[PDB]
Amino acid sequence: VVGGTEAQRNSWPSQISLQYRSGSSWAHTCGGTLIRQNWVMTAAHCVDRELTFRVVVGEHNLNQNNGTEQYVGVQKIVVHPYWNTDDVAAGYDIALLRLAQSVTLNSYVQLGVLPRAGTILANNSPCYITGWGLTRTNGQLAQTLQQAYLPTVDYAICSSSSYWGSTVKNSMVCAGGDGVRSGCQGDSGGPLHCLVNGQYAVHGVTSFVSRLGCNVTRKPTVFTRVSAYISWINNVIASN
Ligand SMILES: [Ca+2]
């Protein structure tokens, strides 16, 4: 997250860290949201590769013990059937992970609330992005969970030529674009929490930013629109 602030430990308890085995260590690669006790939602491009993955719930500081973590393996990865590793702009940047065990819910560890199917936000709706991804373009990961206020940019404005053009589809949410605050590599797969009727619901999955750089004026961070996938989500979860 570029231009963020540290989150309080218990602000965003649906946030997870998606980590892969790197020698004999585990490094952060992506975020994700806990959607059931044994199901994580993340981006398809995070799990494109042949790596060994783990999920950390209850994480606040990547580098230090919090006293709250639960560490769990990934049993099955289900990527969306239309996802094409060579075209992120085509969309379907969404993957569901069945974990090796159920996690225990507590104040650090809660499920993420998902929008009702078809839901579209108004322009300039209040949302926060969270993640441990790079805090500058070509910079480094954060140690502690950062948040940024990142208001929405509706489709008519986001698919306008000054913004994203035809690169963004109606199956995506756009948020931010102020040049100062954004998502960045390592935030991918993570939540966009948006305030709706007094409750924060996860409306996005962080997908892509500009090749020019993470915080680019009029290149808002782009999200997979969670409300476009609600039937797919539930169909996966019933059947696995
Ligand atoms: Ca920790």
Curated annotation (Swiss-Prot):
MF term (GO), any: metal ion binding
Assigned EC number: 3.4.21.36
Coiled-coil zones: none
Record-level GO BP terms: proteolysis
Cysteine-cysteine disulfides: C30-C46, C127-C194, C158-C174, C184-C214
Keywords linked to the UniProt accession: Calcium, Disulfide bond, Hydrolase, Metal-binding, Protease, Secreted, Serine protease, Signal, Zymogen
InterPro entries linked to this entry: Peptidase_S1_Elastase_sf (IPR050850), Peptidase_S1_PA (IPR009003), Peptidase_S1_PA_chymotrypsin (IPR043504), Peptidase_S1A (IPR001314), Trypsin_dom (IPR001254), TRYPSIN_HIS (IPR018114), TRYPSIN_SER (IPR033116)
Active-site feature positions: H45, D93, S188
Tissues where the protein occurs: Pancreas. Basal layers of the epidermis, hair follicle and sebaceous gland epithelia (at protein level).
Cofactor(s) the protein needs: Ca(2+)
Gene3D superfamilies (UniProt xref): Trypsin-like serine proteases
KW Metal-binding (keyword) present: yes
GO CC annotation, single: extracellular space
CDD domains: Tryp_SPc
Compartmental location: Secreted
SUPFAM superfamilies tied to this protein: Trypsin-like serine proteases (SSF50494)
Record field: catalytic activity: Hydrolysis of proteins, including elastin. Preferential cleavage: Ala-|-Xaa
Residue intervals of the Peptidase S1 domain: 1-238
Protein name: Chymotrypsin-like elastase family member 1
Organism: Sus scrofa (Pig)
